[PDB]
Amino acid sequence: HHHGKIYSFDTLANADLIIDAVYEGGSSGNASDDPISKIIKGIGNMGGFRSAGQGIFKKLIVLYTNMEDGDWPDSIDTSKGQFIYYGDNKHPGHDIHDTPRQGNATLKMLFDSTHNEKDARRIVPPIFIFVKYPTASSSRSVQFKGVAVPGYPGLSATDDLIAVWKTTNGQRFQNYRAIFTILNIPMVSRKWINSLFDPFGQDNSLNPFYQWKISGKADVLIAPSTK
């Protein structure tokens, strides 16, 4: 059994983001143990949906899932470079778009931008995907799954963002099922990450993202399994 690179908690602040590398969380027991907010300054330390930047139009979005709940089956298909992600309305209470972190409202904006006939993809920021990946030293450890963009080649706008119904204790409510493409980006450099708020100081790490922004045609991370 072989392992990808594993970053200890005290090495996170200047780490690169590497496909399927593991980033260990803290041991203090408290909130600051969150590995994601240590890796990326500007990103909060809690939530399935996180963003950086002030304004309606963010600089970066992070999607985080624990992959533990069968009711909301988030998944990655490594052979297709496809990520299926459920939105932030997981309980009865408010309308699908009425959520504290505004994940669902933002998902709607991002997919509508992606499929818009005018200014297509204009407001879409880079999206980073992390999944919970417990290690011995920490249960808050995560794994980077890649840079992602809304939609998937061959999927219609009807299919890549669906309001699905669920029932909880007899109460019916809606939540988004969103489908993303994982880009062929093996690494996001520390230089890029430190230069999140300024494209001038960025390197070429996200060139496939900027290409997608221009054309709407993604260079997909296609990774067939070994037997």
Author numbering: -2 to 224
What does the original paper state about this entry?
In the present study we report the crystal structure of the N-terminal DNA binding domain of the LpnPI restriction endonuclease (LpnPI-N), which recognizes the modified cytosine in the sequence context 5′-C(mC)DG-3′ (where D – A/T/G), and provide mutational/loop-swapping analysis that supports the structural model for the sequence recognition. SRA-like domains were recently identified in prokaryotes, where they serve as modules for the modified cytosine recognition by the modification-dependent restriction enzymes that protect host cells from infection by bacteriophages containing methylated, hydroxymethylated or glucosylated DNA. The modified cytosine base is extruded outside the DNA helix and accommodated in a pocket of SRA and SRA-like proteins. In summary, we show here that LpnPI recognizes the context of the flipped cytosine via several surface loops that act as separate DNA binding/recognition modules.
Here, we report the apo-structure of the DNA recognition domain of the cytosine modification-dependent restriction endonuclease LpnPI (LpnPI-N). The structure of LpnPI-N was solved at 2.1 Å resolution. The asymmetric unit contains two almost identical protein molecules (RMSD < 0.5 Å over 209 Cα atoms), with slightly larger deviations observed only at the N-termini and two flexible loops (residues 24–26 and 51–54). The largest contact surface (∼750 Å2) is formed between the N- and C-termini of both A and B subunits that encircle the 160–170 β-hairpins of the symmetry related A/B subunits. This ‘pinching’ interaction, however, is not functionally important, since LpnPI-N is a monomer in solution. The overall structure of LpnPI-N is very similar to that of the SRA-like DNA binding domain of AspBHI (RMSD 1 Å over 170 CA atoms). This allowed us to solve the LpnPI-N structure by molecular replacement using the AspBHI-N structure as an initial model. LpnPI-N is more compact than the corresponding domain of MspJI (224 versus 260 aa). The loops connecting β3–β4, β7–β8 strands and E–F helices are shorter in LpnPI-N by up to 5 aa; nevertheless LpnPI, like AspBHI, contains an 8 aa insertion in the β8 strand that breaks it into two parts.
